[PDB]
Design a binder for this molecule. Structure first.
Ligand SMILES: Nc1ncnc2c1ncn2[C@@H]1O[C@H](COP(=O)(O)OP(=O)(O)O)[C@@H](O)[C@H]1O
Ligand SMILES: O=C(O)C1=C[C@@H](O)[C@@H](O)[C@H](O)C1
Ligand SMILES: [Cl-]
Ligand SMILES: [Cl-]
Ligand SMILES: [Cl-]
Length: 163
C-alpha cells in the first residue's frame, strides 16, 4: 500500500509534492495521470477528446486500483479520480493526503494541460470544480493539509511529520 496517496484539485500540488515527498521518503512516485498516458500511449488531453470522461475514468480507476495494490511509494491521483465511486471505495483504509488550496491561488497556479480547466473563464470553472469536488476529497481524506501559505518544502515536511 502506498506510504501516502495524494488527492486535491488541479494545481493543489499532487504531482509536485508527490515527487518531493517521494524523494524524501526514498521511494518511487507513481502519478496515475503519467501511468495512464503509458497504458494508452496517448496523452490525457487526447483520451478526453477521443473517448470522453466516462472512458478516461474507467481507465483511471483500473490504474488506481492496481497502483493502490502494487505501489509502496507515494501515489498521486489525477485531480478528478475521486469522482469515480470505485476509486473512493478502493481508497478506504489507505493513507490519503488531501492537499487543500483556495480557488484564487489554485487558479493562479494552473495558469499555463487540463481539459476541464482550459479555455476562458478559468476562475469560474475552477470554483465550480471546487464546489463539486470539495465534498469528495474530504470524504476520502485521512489527512487534510492546507497548502495556501505553505511552500512545497513546508507541505512535504508537514506530511512527513504526520506519517
Ligand atoms: N506549496 C506550493 N506553493 C507554491 N507553488 C506550489 C505549491 N505546490 C504546487 N505549486 C506549483 O503549482 C503548480 C501545479 O502543481 P502540480 O503538482 O502540477 O499540481 P497538481 O499535480 O495537483 O495538478 C506547479 O508549477 C508547482 O510548482
Ligand atoms: O480534475 C480533473 O478531472 C483532471 C485532472 C488532471 O490531473 C488529469 O487527471 C485530467 O486532466 C483530469
Ligand atoms: Cl482492489
Ligand atoms: Cl516505490
Ligand atoms: Cl474496494
Amino acid at each position: 500500500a502506498p506510504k501516502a496517496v495524494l488527492v486535491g484539485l488541479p494545481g493543489s500540488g499532487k504531482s509536485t509534492i508527490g515527487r518531493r515527498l517521494a524523494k524524501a521518503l526514498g521511494v518511487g512516485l507513481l502519478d496515475t495521470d503519467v501511468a495512464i498516458e503509458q497504458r494508452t500511449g496517448r496523452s490525457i488531453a487526447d483520451i478526453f477528446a477521443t473517448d470522453g470522461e466516462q472512458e478516461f475514468r474507467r481507465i483511471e480507476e483500473d490504474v488506481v486500483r492496481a497502483a493502490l495494490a502494487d505501489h509502496d511509494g507515494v501515489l498521486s491521483l489525477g485531480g478528478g479520480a475521486v469522482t469515480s465511486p470505485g476509486v473512493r471505495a478502493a481508497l478506504a483504509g489507505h493513507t490519503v493526503v488531501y492537499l487543500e488550496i483556495s480557488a484564487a491561488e489554485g487558479v493562479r497556479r494552473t495558469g499555463g494541460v487540463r481539459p476541464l480547466l482550459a479555455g476562458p473563464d478559468r476562475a469560474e470553472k475552477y470554483r465550480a470544480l471546487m464546489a463539486k469536488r470539495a465534498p469528495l476529497y474530504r470524504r476520502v481524506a485521512t489527512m487534510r493539509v492546507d497548502t495556501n501559505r505553505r511552500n512545497p518544502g513546508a507541505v512535504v515536511r508537514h506530511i512527513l511529520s504526520r506519517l
